Each structure stands twice: as C-alpha cells, then as structure tokens.
Amino acid sequence: VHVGYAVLGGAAGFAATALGALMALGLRAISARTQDAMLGFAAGMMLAASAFSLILPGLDAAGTIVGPGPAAAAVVALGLGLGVLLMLGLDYFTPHARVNRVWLFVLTIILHNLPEGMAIGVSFATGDLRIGLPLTSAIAIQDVPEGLAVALALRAVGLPIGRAVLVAVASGLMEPLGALVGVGISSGFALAYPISMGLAAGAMIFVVSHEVIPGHETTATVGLMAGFALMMFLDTAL
C-alpha cells in the first residue's frame, strides 16, 4: 500500500536526522558561519522540494483530476494557502527557566519537522515513486545537517552533548509520524492529493520563511543557492 512507501520514506527521514545528530558528538561546537551555511542549504533544499516536488506535481495531479483550466491551479493554490494558515495557527496556539526554554526550542524543532514528514507521506500517496523518491531523498539529505545543527544548538543552550544528541534523535521521530499523517489526509478523496500537495508545500514555505529570519548573511545564501541547485539536479535526474 501507499503507507509502505510513506513509512520507509519517514524512516529515512528519522535515520538521516539521527546521523546528523550523531555527528554532533564528535564536533560538540561549530562556528557561527558554518551553522548558518548548513541552515541555508537546508532551506534551499526545502524551498525547491516544495516547488519542484510538491507544487508542480500537485498541479499536474489536479490537472488530470479536474482538467487543464484554472480549477486545478486553484485547488493546489488553496491547499497551499491552507498550509500557510495552518502553520500560522500553530505558532500562535503554540509557545516557543533554562529547563523551559529548552522545551520551547524543542517545540520549535517539532513544529519545524511536522510539514516535512507530511510532505513525504503526501508524495507517496499515489504510490508514485517518481514523486515520493526525489522528494523523500531531498528531505533526508537536508535532515542530516539539520540534525547536526539541532543537536549543536541544544548543546549551546546549556545541554550536555549526550542529552543534546538524544533529544535531536527523538526530534527526528516526528518525520514518520508526519508521514502517516500526510498519507492519511491525502487519501480520502481524489482532490485530497493535490490539496495535500499544496498544503505540504505551503507549510514548508512557512517554516522556511519563519526560520530564514536568522552579520552571517553572505554565507547562508551560498548554502541556500547550493541546496536549491542540488534540488533541481535531483528533480531532473529522478
């Protein structure tokens, strides 16, 4: 079934996060510019994952379901706006004393991860490996530096590196959960698939626009360019 490809896609999600987190054991600390570059790469990957692997495939799905006119782009775009609105609804409904500021930063990481799991599941809802696999693989690529980054950031707020890595790994647990959810919401009816692809792309564009906010400027855009270029390459080859 679809859940299968979605469950293994989420699984690669969690593994990749865990690998980055485990790399944090060696390093313990990293320069500000290297962390900025890593994040910029991760945002570039996500920005184009939602463009090339979610919106355009979503529009083509919608186009076969309802025809070539604006109805399809309307479905995809309304799903996308719904995804923005949902991530904006969380973030308000969700707050994010050292013990409590660690919890708020963890909530940030979990709210971040929710859309990416969802996107993996949504991409594997038609069983289409030519939509799930490049998406999923981009998600996992950028999960590595982000697990690294997450664990280091938690060490930096005051945790011993071991707890920091343990919490990063647990964080990565949110990808398969979101994969189950994305495979849920995208199977109830025909339009559920392109609606869900819009919705996933929108949620990701929101977490990026809300976390691209973090000198340390020229370095993060080299990363963003790299991560965006690499995605285009993945879309073409896969």
Added chain:
Amino acid sequence: VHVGYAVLGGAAGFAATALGALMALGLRAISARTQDAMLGFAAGMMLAASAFSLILPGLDAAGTIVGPGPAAAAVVALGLGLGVLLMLGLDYFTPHARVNRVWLFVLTIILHNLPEGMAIGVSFATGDLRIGLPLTSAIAIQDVPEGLAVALALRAVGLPIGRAVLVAVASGLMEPLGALVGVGISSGFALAYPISMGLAAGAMIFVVSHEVIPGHETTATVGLMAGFALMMFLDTAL
C-alpha cells in the same frame, strides 16, 4: 602519517565508486538525459574541487613557502600547466572487436580516475584535514553517480550487468593508488606541495574539458551548476 589520511581518503573514493556501481544492478538502464545530468553534476564537483580545494589552497601554501609576490602563483600555475601537459601526454601515448573496445573504454575510465586519487593524496600531504577532508568528500560524492554511470555505460556497450558492475568496482580501485601517488609526489620538498596541488587541479580540469565534450545540453548544465554550487557550499562549511 600523511599516507594514513590519504589512504582513508582513497578508501572512501573506492567505496563510493562501488556504491554507485552496485546501484546499477537495480537499474540496468537509464535515460540519456539522466546520465547526462549525472555527468554534469560530476564535472561541476570536479571543476570547483580543483578551484576551491586545490588551486586556492595551493596558492596559500605556495605563498607561505616563497612569499606573497607572483613567485607563489607562478609555482601553482606551472604545476597546473604541467598537469594539463601530463594528461595530454597520456591520451596520446594511450589508446582509448567488442572485446577491445571495452578495453579502450576501461582505459578511459582509469585515465579519468588517476587525477582524482592523486588530488586526494595531495590534499592530505600536509595532514591538513581542512584541505583534504572537503576535497576528499567532494571526490566521493561525485564518485557515486560516476560509478553508477560507468557501470551502466559498460552494460550498454554489450556487457552483462554483473560484469559491468564488477568492472566499475575494480575501476574505483584506481583512487587509492592515485592517493598513494599524490602523497608521494607532494612530499619530496617544500614546493612539492603547491606544485602538486597545481598539478592535480590541472589534470582534473583536463579530464573534465576532455569529457565535457558530450541534444542533451540543457540537462548537463543543470547538473554542472548543481555540482559546482554544492562544492562552494562544502568549501564554506568545511
């Protein structure tokens, strides 16, 4: 010693090649445009590996050895021209009836691989992990799609996929050999290091300029851009 980091860098070389080759077992055949994209990515990685990880570090090495004037850039540039001339000397001295055209294509792959092993060894000749590790890791990244590509190409000239993959893996054996050689030629005297960095960068720019020759045009430049962008990202983060 330096040979240690060089031997493990070469080792990652061979492993990566083998992983791409093993992936060819599943696929057996691939579209022309996906193979072109893969190669374009591999050329972009190499082009910037020789720029950002060989020439500029080579110039800085040369600059500390002989001073900031043109003497350093002269050493690096003369090494680079020597590397072009050496790869041009091979290719003439080296030819590259199905059984014999497979051997000529294998010779092509071995002549291709020689500079990359050398570059790994040259990058680890000062023991400087900030020069070897990003270089080495770029070499291994692009060894994966190139093992894939090599094995598929050999299947396509008429080999059974099993022999094709076996020969691709064996091919990847040339990276640690070249790592030993690059760690040799770069240790005999002080200038040997920046001379060798020029030489490695030049040999690679030659094999790229000689194999970038292969419609199927717009797709390979998406790959080249991606592979070049990714290298910049690696140079910055590592």
